[PDB]
Amino acid sequence: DITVYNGQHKEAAQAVADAFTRATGIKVKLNCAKGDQLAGQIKEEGSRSPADVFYSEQIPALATLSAANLLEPLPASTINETRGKGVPVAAKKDWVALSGRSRVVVYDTRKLSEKDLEKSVLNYATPKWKNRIGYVPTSGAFLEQIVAIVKLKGEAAALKWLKGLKEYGKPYAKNSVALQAVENGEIDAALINNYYWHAFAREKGVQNVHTRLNFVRHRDPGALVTYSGAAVLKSSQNKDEAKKFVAFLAGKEGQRALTAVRAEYPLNPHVVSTFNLEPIAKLEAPQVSATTVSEKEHATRLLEQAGMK
Ligand SMILES: [Fe+3]
C-alpha cells in the first residue's frame, strides 16, 4: 500500500493508479497538488515524509529533489523502458521520464487562422497582441519555456519576452483556465501544453469547441516539448511496491493506461497513442538539454525581474 505525491493531473494519476491497482491489488493514495509545492514539501519533510512515490508533470521538480539526494536509484529496466531519442535521463538513475507534452498556441478559429499566428513564440510579446495572447506565469512548462528561450536565444531575449508578455499579454492561474478563457473569447489565443486541448474536446464535444492548436515547429523555442516523470523517495517504507509502481508507469501497460486517456506522448517505444497525436518528429521540437536546478533558478530570477513574481 503506497502513497503518491501527485503533481500530475488528477485524470492522469487516477488512470495509472487504478490500472496499477487492478494488476497488483496494491492500493494507491493520491495526494494531489503542484509538483513545485510537493517537491518543496518533500524537502521539508526529510525522513518524515509519508510519500512513497513522486509523480511530476515536469522534470525540474524531479531534478531539484534529485539534487538534494532524496530519490531512490532505480534499476536499468525501469530506466531503459522509456530510453529514447531526446528523452531526459537521470545521472543517478533516481528518476525516470514517462511521457512528453508539447508547447502549443491554442487559438479561436472564430477570430484567427493558423496563417494569422506567429512563426516564433518570441513574437507574442508585442503591442500587436496587446490583450490578445494568454500565458500562465506559474505553469511548470512555462518555466521550462523560459529555460529553452535562454538557451536558444539568450537571457536577454528571455527577459524581453517575459516583459513583453507582462506588458501586452494576459496571465492566468492554470493552463486549463487559459484555454477556457480563450474559448469564452476573452482572449484570442494562449500558450499552453497540447494535452489540455484533447481533454476539453472530450468533455465538451469537439463540435462545441472553436479553438485549434497551432504548431510552430522549425526548432522554434515555442515548439519545445517537455517531460513528465516519476520517482521513488529514499524515505519510503514501501520501497519495493513503490519501485513496482514506477516500473508499471514506464512499462507498456502503464503507458497504455496513461496515454489511453491523456493526450501526452508516451515514451516507451513499444507503445503508440490512439489519440491521433501529432507525430513527435513533425513537432520539429528544438533539441534542448534538460533543465538544470540552477537553470531553473535563473529562470525564476527572470520571472521576478519581469513582474511575474
Ligand atoms: Fe499541466
Short mmCIF file of all heavy atoms in Angstrom, two decimals, residues 7-9 57-58 101 139-141 175-176 193 195-196 262 264, ligand 1:
data_model
loop_
_atom_site.label_atom_id
_atom_site.label_comp_id
_atom_site.label_asym_id
_atom_site.label_seq_id
_atom_site.Cartn_x
_atom_site.Cartn_y
_atom_site.Cartn_z
N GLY A 7 1.92 15.40 -8.55
CA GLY A 7 1.97 16.69 -9.22
C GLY A 7 1.30 16.60 -10.58
O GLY A 7 1.05 17.62 -11.23
N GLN A 8 1.01 15.38 -11.01
CA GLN A 8 0.39 15.11 -12.30
C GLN A 8 -1.09 15.45 -12.26
O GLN A 8 -1.71 15.52 -11.20
CB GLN A 8 0.64 13.65 -12.67
CG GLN A 8 0.18 13.17 -14.01
CD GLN A 8 0.52 14.07 -15.17
OE1 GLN A 8 -0.22 15.02 -15.47
NE2 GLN A 8 1.62 13.78 -15.85
N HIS A 9 -1.70 15.68 -13.43
CA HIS A 9 -3.13 15.98 -13.45
C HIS A 9 -3.93 14.83 -12.85
O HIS A 9 -3.58 13.66 -13.04
CB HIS A 9 -3.61 16.26 -14.87
CG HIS A 9 -3.15 17.58 -15.41
ND1 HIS A 9 -3.70 18.78 -15.03
CD2 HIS A 9 -2.17 17.89 -16.29
CE1 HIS A 9 -3.10 19.77 -15.66
NE2 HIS A 9 -2.16 19.26 -16.43
N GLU A 57 4.69 16.59 -13.48
CA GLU A 57 4.36 16.99 -14.84
C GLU A 57 5.62 17.38 -15.61
O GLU A 57 5.62 17.34 -16.84
CB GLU A 57 3.39 18.16 -14.84
CG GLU A 57 1.94 17.80 -14.55
CD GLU A 57 1.00 18.95 -14.84
OE1 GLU A 57 0.83 19.28 -16.03
OE2 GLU A 57 0.45 19.53 -13.88
N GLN A 58 6.65 17.77 -14.88
CA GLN A 58 7.89 18.30 -15.45
C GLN A 58 9.11 17.72 -14.75
O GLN A 58 9.06 17.43 -13.55
CB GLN A 58 7.91 19.83 -15.35
CG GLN A 58 6.62 20.52 -15.72
CD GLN A 58 6.24 20.37 -17.18
OE1 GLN A 58 7.06 19.98 -18.02
NE2 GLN A 58 4.99 20.67 -17.50
N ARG A 101 4.99 16.32 -23.40
CA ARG A 101 3.89 17.21 -23.79
C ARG A 101 4.44 18.42 -24.55
O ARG A 101 5.48 18.98 -24.18
CB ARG A 101 3.08 17.66 -22.57
CG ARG A 101 3.82 18.49 -21.54
CD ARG A 101 4.40 17.65 -20.42
NE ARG A 101 3.40 17.03 -19.57
CZ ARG A 101 2.66 17.63 -18.65
NH1 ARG A 101 2.78 18.93 -18.40
NH2 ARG A 101 1.78 16.93 -17.95
N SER A 139 2.96 28.15 -14.53
CA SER A 139 2.98 26.82 -15.12
C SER A 139 4.40 26.24 -15.18
O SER A 139 5.34 26.91 -15.61
CB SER A 139 2.39 26.84 -16.53
OG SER A 139 3.30 26.29 -17.47
N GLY A 140 4.54 24.99 -14.77
CA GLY A 140 5.82 24.30 -14.86
C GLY A 140 6.40 24.34 -16.26
O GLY A 140 7.60 24.53 -16.44
N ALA A 141 5.54 24.17 -17.27
CA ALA A 141 6.01 24.16 -18.65
C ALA A 141 6.40 25.56 -19.11
O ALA A 141 7.30 25.74 -19.93
CB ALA A 141 4.96 23.57 -19.57
N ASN A 175 -3.31 26.38 -17.03
CA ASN A 175 -3.39 26.23 -18.48
C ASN A 175 -4.84 26.01 -18.92
O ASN A 175 -5.24 26.49 -19.98
CB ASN A 175 -2.52 25.07 -18.95
CG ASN A 175 -1.05 25.41 -19.01
OD1 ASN A 175 -0.68 26.53 -19.32
ND2 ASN A 175 -0.21 24.43 -18.70
N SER A 176 -5.59 25.28 -18.10
CA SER A 176 -6.99 25.00 -18.41
C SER A 176 -7.82 26.28 -18.38
O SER A 176 -8.63 26.52 -19.28
CB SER A 176 -7.57 23.98 -17.43
OG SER A 176 -7.33 24.35 -16.08
N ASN A 193 0.12 23.75 -22.91
CA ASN A 193 0.56 22.44 -23.35
C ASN A 193 -0.51 21.79 -24.22
O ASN A 193 -1.69 22.13 -24.11
CB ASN A 193 0.87 21.53 -22.17
CG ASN A 193 1.96 22.04 -21.25
OD1 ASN A 193 1.93 21.76 -20.05
ND2 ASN A 193 2.92 22.78 -21.80
N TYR A 195 -1.92 18.76 -24.39
CA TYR A 195 -2.83 17.71 -23.96
C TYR A 195 -4.14 18.26 -23.41
O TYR A 195 -5.16 17.57 -23.40
CB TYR A 195 -2.17 16.81 -22.91
CG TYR A 195 -1.60 17.57 -21.74
CD1 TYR A 195 -2.37 17.92 -20.64
CD2 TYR A 195 -0.26 17.95 -21.74
CE1 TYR A 195 -1.84 18.62 -19.58
CE2 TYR A 195 0.28 18.65 -20.68
CZ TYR A 195 -0.51 18.98 -19.60
OH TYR A 195 0.03 19.68 -18.54
N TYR A 196 -4.12 19.51 -22.93
CA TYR A 196 -5.35 20.10 -22.42
C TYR A 196 -6.43 20.13 -23.50
O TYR A 196 -7.62 19.97 -23.22
CB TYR A 196 -5.12 21.51 -21.90
CG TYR A 196 -4.20 21.61 -20.70
CD1 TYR A 196 -2.84 21.83 -20.87
CD2 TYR A 196 -4.69 21.50 -19.41
CE1 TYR A 196 -1.99 21.92 -19.77
CE2 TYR A 196 -3.86 21.59 -18.31
CZ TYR A 196 -2.51 21.80 -18.50
OH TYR A 196 -1.67 21.90 -17.41
N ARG A 262 -5.06 10.35 -21.58
CA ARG A 262 -4.46 11.68 -21.61
C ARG A 262 -3.63 11.87 -22.88
O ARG A 262 -2.93 10.95 -23.31
CB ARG A 262 -3.61 11.92 -20.37
CG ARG A 262 -4.31 11.69 -19.04
CD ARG A 262 -5.24 12.83 -18.68
NE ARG A 262 -4.53 14.08 -18.39
CZ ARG A 262 -5.08 15.28 -18.45
NH1 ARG A 262 -6.36 15.42 -18.78
NH2 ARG A 262 -4.36 16.36 -18.17
N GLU A 264 -0.85 12.84 -23.84
CA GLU A 264 0.59 13.06 -23.74
C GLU A 264 1.36 12.04 -24.57
O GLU A 264 0.89 10.93 -24.82
CB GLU A 264 1.04 13.01 -22.27
CG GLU A 264 0.50 14.17 -21.45
CD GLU A 264 1.19 14.34 -20.11
OE1 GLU A 264 2.38 13.99 -20.00
OE2 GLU A 264 0.54 14.83 -19.16
FE FE B 1 -0.46 20.52 -16.99
#
